[PDB]
């Protein structure tokens, strides 16, 4: 059709008026010329630039991708093959075959959607979907164009294969058995090495449980990956995918529940205010900043200030250290709580899930078991904080396997066959109750909880909390409940700002105090909640770094070590 050429010209005009895209192509060509690895034939186009230049073409792509994108594909391919000479004869006949793909970015407006917000009214349109990748399939190539050669004639004839799973518009069904004879009847020769192939993979993007509504079945979408972006995300990755939400097959129109197979032809993959900054920084200048953020951790829960302080430090976290030797160092802080019930053990454990940017609340499966191997509860915890209740209920396998996660922050699969290493950069907080119904302060926590010292001591801070029979505790603990008969969103922004925009580093002045106190701890023979080892020295570094996160400073000062040492003694005495 004639209108197709006009739409092609608009993209050519779009490329002309925005030199950034075409000069980037020229830079890519120069890079390929210097290597004459080869970069793929894909560039990214901003939708905002297209909208500001031609709304109808921009709207046409979103509403009718099959009728507006292929004109852009032809325009880009024609410009690429004509911007330079492509001098090499043999290489030009093969390297220039690949059509130049397009990728999209920018604001999507009404089409910025989720697997649940996406509906059938948006089908056969271009949409952007944000979700979590659940599983993927093996990459396999797609046949695009074949080349035929007759021995008796010595000349080449080419044939194309297209299908609706990769073609934007529904073309006449091409696929068939490979031909054997040409027009003249001469036997043809199958030139495997001159056929063009494109890799293909399907992924299953799902709505996150973090945002799913309660009591409703999930929504998920199938996404097709092609060519160069065929492998960009692993299962569990939070991804943003732009593609043509399109139907397949038939809903029983030919030859009952069978519906049209709606899925997205993915063409782009992206893995996932100033006033808030002017507020977070401003409020930190007062002398009592740290106590403010400790009170706002479940304010209705009375007491337990130090554990709230420890939880906040765990949320801020330390800095994992890497070296040119390839070493990795622990930077996460783990806390375990023990004692008699009815002391808000699970209340604060529940509160952490309500405060962290990402958190997983489960109970004592933890590791990947067997095939893709399912991602265990501790496996899915990367870059998050873990809330486990009934921590005593761990089985023998869980108790012996949690050691690697606790210290190395890594999950190692060593099952029969596949071996792999999975990131487990997670801070673990847990609570437990005595087996014998009541806690005995006359005996150590190892003799009460029945978890081995080799497991209990791995937690940096072990809190033993017991409600005394003293009346003054009973008065306050009951009055605070009866009294019920800086904002939390700001606090969560503060944690988001601190964990990303500031990375504190050590200083010899802090070392002067940290090493001194550890030396005193090793020298002090008085009984304590845990025997002092080198782990406490690492804990002090993490705690001081965690406090530096609160102060929003790239360096470390004396007060950071003073607070870290003081709190550590509290958990030990």
């Amino acid at each position: 059709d004639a209108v197709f050429g006009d739409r092609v010209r608009r993209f050519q005009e779009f490329l002309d008026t925005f030199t950034s895209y075409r000069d980037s192509v020229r830079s890519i060509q120069v890079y390929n010329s210097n290597n004459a690895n080869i970069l793929p034939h894909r560039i990214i186009i901003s939708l905002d630039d297209l909208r500001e230049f031609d709304r109808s073409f921009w709207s046409g792509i979103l509403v009718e991708p099959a009728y507006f994108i292929p004109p852009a594909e032809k325009a880009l391919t024609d410009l690429a093959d004509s911007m330079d000479d492509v001098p090499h004869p043999n290489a030009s006949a093969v390297s220039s075959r690949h059509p130049w793909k397009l990728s999209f970015k920018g604001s999507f407006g009404a089409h910025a959607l989720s697997p649940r917000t996406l509906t059938a009214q948006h089908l056969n349109k271009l949409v952007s979907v944000e979700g979590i990748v659940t599983k993927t399939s093996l990459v396999r190539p797609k046949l695009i164009r074949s080349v035929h050669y007759a021995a008796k004639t010595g000349r080449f004839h080419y044939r194309d294969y297209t299908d609706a799973t990769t073609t934007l518009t529904t073309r006449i069904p091409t696929p068939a058995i490979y031909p054997t004879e040409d027009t003249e009847g001469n036997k043809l020769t199958t030139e495997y090495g001159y056929s063009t192939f494109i890799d293909h993979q399907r992924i299953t993007v799902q709505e996150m449980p973090e945002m799913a509504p309660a009591g409703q079945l999930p929504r998920s979408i199938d996404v097709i990956l092609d060519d160069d972006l065929v492998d960009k995300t692993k299962p569990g990755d939070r991804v943003n995918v732009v593609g043509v939400f399109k139907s397949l097959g038939a809903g029983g129109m030919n030859q009952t529940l069978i519906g049209f197979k709606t899925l997205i032809l993915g063409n782009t993959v992206y893995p996932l205010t100033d006033f808030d900054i002017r507020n977070i920084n401003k409020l930190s200048k007062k002398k009592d900043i740290f106590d403010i953020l400790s009170q706002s951790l479940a304010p209705s829960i009375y007491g337990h200030d130090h554990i709230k302080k420890a939880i906040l430090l765990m949320l801020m976290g330390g800095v994992e250290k890497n070296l040119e030797n390839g070493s990795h160092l622990r930077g996460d802080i783990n806390i375990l709580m023990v004692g008699d019930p009815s002391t808000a053990k699970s209340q604060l454990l529940r509160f952490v899930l309500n405060t962290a940017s990402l958190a997983i609340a489960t109970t004592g499966g933890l590791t990947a078991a067997v095939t893709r191997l399912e991602a265990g509860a501790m496996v899915l915890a990367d870059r998050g904080v873990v809330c486990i209740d009934e921590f005593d209920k761990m089985t023998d396998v869980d108790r012996v396997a949690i050691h690697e996660v606790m210290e190395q922050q890594t999950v190692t699969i060593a099952k029969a066959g596949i071996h792999t290493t999975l990131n487990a950069r997670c801070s673990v907080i847990a609570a437990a109750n005595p087996v014998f119904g009541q806690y005995d302060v006359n005996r150590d926590p190892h003799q009460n909880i029945a978890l081995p010292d080799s497991l209990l001591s791995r937690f940096d801070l072990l809190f033993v909390v017991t409600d005394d029979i003293n009346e003054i505790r009973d008065r306050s603990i009951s009055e605070h409940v009866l009294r019920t008969h800086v904002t939390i969103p700001f606090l969560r922004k503060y944690v988001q700002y601190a964990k990303e925009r500031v990375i504190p580093q050590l200083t010899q002045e802090a070392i002067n105090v940290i090493v001194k106190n550890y030396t005193d701890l090793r020298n002090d023979d008085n009984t304590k909640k845990s025997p002092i080892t080198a782990r406490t020295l690492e804990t002090l570094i993490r705690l001081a770094t965690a406090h530096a996160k609160v102060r929003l400073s790239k360096t470390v000062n004396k007060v950071d070590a003073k607070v870290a040492a003081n709190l550590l003694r509290f958990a030990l005495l």
């Binding site: 396999r140 056929s195 060593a414 099952k415 029969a416």
Partner: protein, 148 residues
Amino acid sequence: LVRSLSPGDIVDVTGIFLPLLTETYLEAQFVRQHTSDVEERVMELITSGDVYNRLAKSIAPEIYGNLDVKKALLLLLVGGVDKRVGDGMKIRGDINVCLMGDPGVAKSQLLKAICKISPRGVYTTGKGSSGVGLTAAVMKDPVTDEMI
């Protein structure tokens, strides 16, 4: 070329990569098992002559006061001589090392370092990653009823 490869071998295989989704395979053409480009680097260290202590101090350069343990690790990395006695007899030429120690003595960082350094190192925790992760098992293929 049949009966050239064997299970578990580490080889470099040269061939042709051959194929609406097409399935791919490789037609084997030449196979080999596993140098001045690296002899220059080897020459430098032996020129200095510091062999035992330098390499024993090289493994885990961020762990304090374990030189005697590192030396045993250095020999274990190198290993002994697998003496084939003959007459059907066999004597292992490998070194097995056990590291007992109190918590907080960095006896697990060495385990990570050994796996990192060795080209064939495998890292394992707990009960050998359970009984299924330890040793091995035969699994039936549902496609061909074969067991691998």
